[PDB]
Amino acid sequence: MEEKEILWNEAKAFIAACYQELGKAAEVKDRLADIKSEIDLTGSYVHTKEELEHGAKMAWRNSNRCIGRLFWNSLNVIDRRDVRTKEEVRDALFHHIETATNNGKIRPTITIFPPEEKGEKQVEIWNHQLIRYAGYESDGERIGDPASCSLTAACEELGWRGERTDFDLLPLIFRMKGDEQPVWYELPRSLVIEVPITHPDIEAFSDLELKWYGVPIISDMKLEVGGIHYNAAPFNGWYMGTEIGARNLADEKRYDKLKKVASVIGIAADYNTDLWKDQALVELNKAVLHSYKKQGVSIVDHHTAASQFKRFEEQAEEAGRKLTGDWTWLIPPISPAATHIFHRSYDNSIVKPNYFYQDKPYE
Amino acid sequence: MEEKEILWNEAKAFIAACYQELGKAAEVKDRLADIKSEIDLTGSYVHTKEELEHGAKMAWRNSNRCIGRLFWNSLNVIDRRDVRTKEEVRDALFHHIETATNNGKIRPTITIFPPEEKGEKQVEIWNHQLIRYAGYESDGERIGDPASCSLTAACEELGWRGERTDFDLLPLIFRMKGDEQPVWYELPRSLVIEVPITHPDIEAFSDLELKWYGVPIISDMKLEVGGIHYNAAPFNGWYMGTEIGARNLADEKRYDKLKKVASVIGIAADYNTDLWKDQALVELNKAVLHSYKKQGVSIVDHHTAASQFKRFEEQAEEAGRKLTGDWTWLIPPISPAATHIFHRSYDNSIVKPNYFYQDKPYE
Ligand code: HEM
Ligand code: HEM
Ligand SMILES: Cc1cc(N)nc(CCc2cc(CN)cc(CCc3cc(C)cc(N)n3)c2)c1
Numbered sequence: 141m142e143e144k145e146i147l148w149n150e151a152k153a154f155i156a157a158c159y160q161e162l163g164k165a166a167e168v169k170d171r172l173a174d175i176k177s178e179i180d181l182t183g184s185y186v187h188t189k190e191e192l193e194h195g196a197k198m199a200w201r202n203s204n205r206c207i208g209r210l211f212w213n214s215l216n217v218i219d220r221r222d223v224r225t226k227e228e229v230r231d232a233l234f235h236h237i238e239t240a241t242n243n244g245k246i247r248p249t250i251t252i253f254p255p256e257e258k259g260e261k262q263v264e265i266w267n268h269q270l271i272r273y274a275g276y277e278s279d280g281e282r283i284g285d286p287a288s289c290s291l292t293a294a295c296e297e298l299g300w301r302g303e304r305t306d307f308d309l310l311p312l313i314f315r316m317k318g319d320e321q322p323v324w325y326e327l328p329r330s331l332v333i334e335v336p337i338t339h340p341d342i343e344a345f346s347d348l349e350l351k352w353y354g355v356p357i358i359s360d361m362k363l364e365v366g367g368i369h370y371n372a373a374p375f376n377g378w379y380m381g382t383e384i385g386a387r388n389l390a391d392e393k394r395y396d397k398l399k400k401v402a403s404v405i406g407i408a409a410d411y412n413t414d415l416w417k418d419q420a421l422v423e424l425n426k427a428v429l430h431s432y433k434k435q436g437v438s439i440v441d442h443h444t445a446a447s448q449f450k451r452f453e454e455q456a457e458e459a460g461r462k463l464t465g466d467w468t469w470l471i472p473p474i475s476p477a478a479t480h481i482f483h484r485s486y487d488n489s490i491v492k493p494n495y496f497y498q499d500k501p502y503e
Numbered sequence: 504m505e506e507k508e509i510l511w512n513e514a515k516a517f518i519a520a521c522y523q524e525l526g527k528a529a530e531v532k533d534r535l536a537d538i539k540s541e542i543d544l545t546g547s548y549v550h551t552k553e554e555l556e557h558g559a560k561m562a563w564r565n566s567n568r569c570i571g572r573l574f575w576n577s578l579n580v581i582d583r584r585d586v587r588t589k590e591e592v593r594d595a596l597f598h599h600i601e602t603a604t605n606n607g608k609i610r611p612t613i614t615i616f617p618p619e620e621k622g623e624k625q626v627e628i629w630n631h632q633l634i635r636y637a638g639y640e641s642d643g644e645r646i647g648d649p650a651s652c653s654l655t656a657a658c659e660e661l662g663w664r665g666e667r668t669d670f671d672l673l674p675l676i677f678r679m680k681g682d683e684q685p686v687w688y689e690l691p692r693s694l695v696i697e698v699p700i701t702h703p704d705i706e707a708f709s710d711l712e713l714k715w716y717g718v719p720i721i722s723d724m725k726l727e728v729g730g731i732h733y734n735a736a737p738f739n740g741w742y743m744g745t746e747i748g749a750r751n752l753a754d755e756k757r758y759d760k761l762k763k764v765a766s767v768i769g770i771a772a773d774y775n776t777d778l779w780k781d782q783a784l785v786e787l788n789k790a791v792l793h794s795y796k797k798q799g800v801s802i803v804d805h806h807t808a809a810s811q812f813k814r815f816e817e818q819a820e821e822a823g824r825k826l827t828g829d830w831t832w833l834i835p836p837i838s839p840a841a842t843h844i845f846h847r848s849y850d851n852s853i854v855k856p857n858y859f860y861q862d863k864p865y866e
């Protein structure tokens with residue numbers, strides 16, 4: 141064994157750790173044997189519902205780049221390893237969107253599909269997030285979100301067509317084992333909450349006609365638990381405001397709105413020493429938090445989020461767990477020195493279970 | 504040899520590299536022999552004026568944490584390896600302040616004193632910067648700059664006494680080889696430029712009565728060139744505005760002025776979601792750049808500085824030199840995602856010549 145030996149070692153490590161945390165310590169030997177025989181028989185093994193749930197939660201806890209980890213143990217885990225058809229996959233994805241959105245009171249949720257077998261995917265999801273805007277470039281200038289340009293082009297190869305507004309919802313797109321091409325389904329608009337961006341004090345701000353979607357649902361990462369590869373396992377939290385105001389709407393390679401923001405808030409955008417970009421960033425970011433709160437859609441500001449992560453740190457030390465983190469992702473892109481994160485270091489070691497990048501099926 | 508063998512290898516590497524850049528390639532063999540014999544004879548070697556100047560410039564070029572490196576080759580190098588007395592040291596430090604300040608049109612300058620011999624310092628400087636404010640804690644609350652608390656306490660052990668304003672200038676303090684205690688000399692106020700902080704639009708801002716000094720002159724790092732240790736070698740640039748507005752005046756462990764800023768600019772400081780800290784940071788940072796420019800004192804904003812560093816990058820590739828950098832120090836503490844630095848990675852390898860930390864003589 142080499143491939144199956146890797147599986148065995150990962151399973152031994154995970155089960156011990158998992159059962160210890162669950163207090164099931166005395167059950168480890170028996171479970172480990174059953175697993176051993178099941179690998180010898182089938183070349184793999186199946187997680188119990190408890191192992192899967194706790195595995196997914198552990199994976200979140202170990203995600204070095206995530207500032208929202210305080211709430212790892214409250215992850216809502218939906219077990220969909222039973223799906224076999226594209227209608228079932230589609231309906232599970234619609235359901236995830238609905239139950240996670242929860243009328244605006246967002247629930248951190250993951251839906252878990254059948255894992256790879258021989259490195260053979262059962263389900264291959266093409267979307268980066270379940271809800272995202274399309275992007276086009278035939279230059280009347282760019283249209284929409286440039287980060288979606290390649291996926292948008294692939295969808296349109298498959299017969300979909302966007303309206304070419306700056307906010308076209310992409311369809312869900314995924315491929316089933318045995319099919320050469322993926323399928324796509326348009327998102328029901330009643331499922332997707334969107335928030336118009338207004339400013340608490342500046343009436344002109346609505347003239348920008350900005351909006352964003354309520355729930356970021358990452359759908360392109362692999363969840364690995366105990367040597368088992370769940371390549372299809374979409375998860376969501378709620379947004380930190382800076383992700384929208386400082387990146388999605390502000391980056392030059394994304395929506396690039398800072399100059400327009402400066403104009404509506406009535407400052408000149410001519411001199412670096414005026415810090416007009418910094419000023420525009422703050423008002424935009426204030427508008428985002430205000431708009432989400434007014435609509436009743438969950439969101440966290442970067443200061444509150446950092447305070448929560450300080451508690452995660454304290455909780456980790458208190459439970460004897462080593463803390464891991466990626467300082468470059470944990471600091472907010474706005475006023476990072478105003479948070480405690482900026483003034484300490486973190487160990488960027490990779491602990492499993494965890495979420496990992498995988499190759500895109502397209503481009 | 505072990506200690507002297509380390510010296511030899513460092514000297515071989517530096518001289519080759521230095522002469523290659525200076526075009527003196529054909530002179531390397533002869534110089535290398537002379538050095539070899541001088542190490543065999545005296546246990547060390549003496550740099551030529553050209554080697555020292557270029558060594559100091561290389562050291563700046565290799566400083567991973569510095570965003571101002573575009574201008575490395577224009578460093579003004581003052582050779583003071585001839586000093587033997589404390590009056591000479593004091594006068595060299597006064598002269599550095601004067602020539603670097605240059606009536607506000609700041610010249611990046613380094614003054615280089617005699618190097619360590621057997622790891623024995625000839626001159627030991629206690630100041631962190633040549634110009635810095637004292638700090639006290641007998642709590643009527645804190646007074647001045649908390650980062651200067653330990654050094655301030657050491658100066659006052661030696662007979663100096665501060666006025667206990669929030670902006671007391673510390674005296675110069677340094678120790679000569681052979682003396683048990685250091686000496687201190689008060690800074691002549693006519694040498695030190697200071698800038699009152701006002702806001703371009705908000706008249707009330709002067710009510711905070713903030714100020715800062717014009718020139719940051721690092722005096723506690725070791726310059727290493729070709730195996731020779733210049734432990735005493737103060738250097739200066741001009742400030743990037745964020746260093747003053749986002750750190751020195753803003754940090755809770757420093758002057759902690761953000762709540763007072765919020766009050767004078769007329770925003771509430773009650774809710775995280777109002778981003779009052781971010782807003783206050785921007786106006787404070789605008790005030791800093793405006794105040795330095797109005798007084799005719801050199802300063803750079805973080806956007807211009809990042810543009811300059813992009814040119815350093817391009818210059819490095821163009822000259823076939825590997826680029827090194829520390830991403831965690833290069834990004835500005837304000838709107839870092841608005842600069843190109845944030846969106847790329849850097850190799851944090853240590854190349855010599857370079858500037859290094861050394862142990863404090865006090866605390
Ligand atoms: C509850 C609300 C949540 C918030 C506010 C939050 C916040 C964030 C932020 C701000 C980032 C990085 C963005 C950046 O630095 O530019 C991030 C990254 C990440 N978060 Fe969370 N998160 C949350 C929930 C979750 C959940 C439920 C999971 C998974 C179960 C998760 C896993 C991750 C992962 C894996 C990354 C790194 C992604 C990558 O490498 O591309 N987070 N989180
Ligand atoms: C010309 C104007 C200069 C500017 C605007 C500039 C800017 C900066 C900034 C902003 C930092 C780090 C502060 C932070 O990230 O929080 C820095 C660090 C540094 N700079 Fe420069 N710098 C300049 C000139 C110089 C010169 C002349 C030298 C030496 C010859 C130098 C060597 C360094 C070093 C060694 C560090 C790291 C210090 C440490 O590790 O504590 N810089 N520079
Ligand atoms: C250059 C750069 C730096 C940096 N720190 N971060 C980024 C990208 C941030 C990013 C990237 C991806 C895709 N790899 C995905 C995200 C989404 C993270 C996320 C995930 C979840 C579940 C909730 C939530 N609020 N946020 C952020 C780029």
Ligand SMILES: Cc1cc(N)nc(CCc2cc(CN)cc(CCc3cc(C)cc(N)n3)c2)c1
Binds near residue numbers: 483720742746831
């Ligand atoms: C937590 C933390 C992060 C960070 N990026 N930077 C710091 C400190 C910044 C700092 C620290 C020291 C002392 N080690 C010295 C400086 C001064 C750098 C400097 C040096 C020179 C010569 C010019 C200039 N404008 N700035 C900055 C702390």
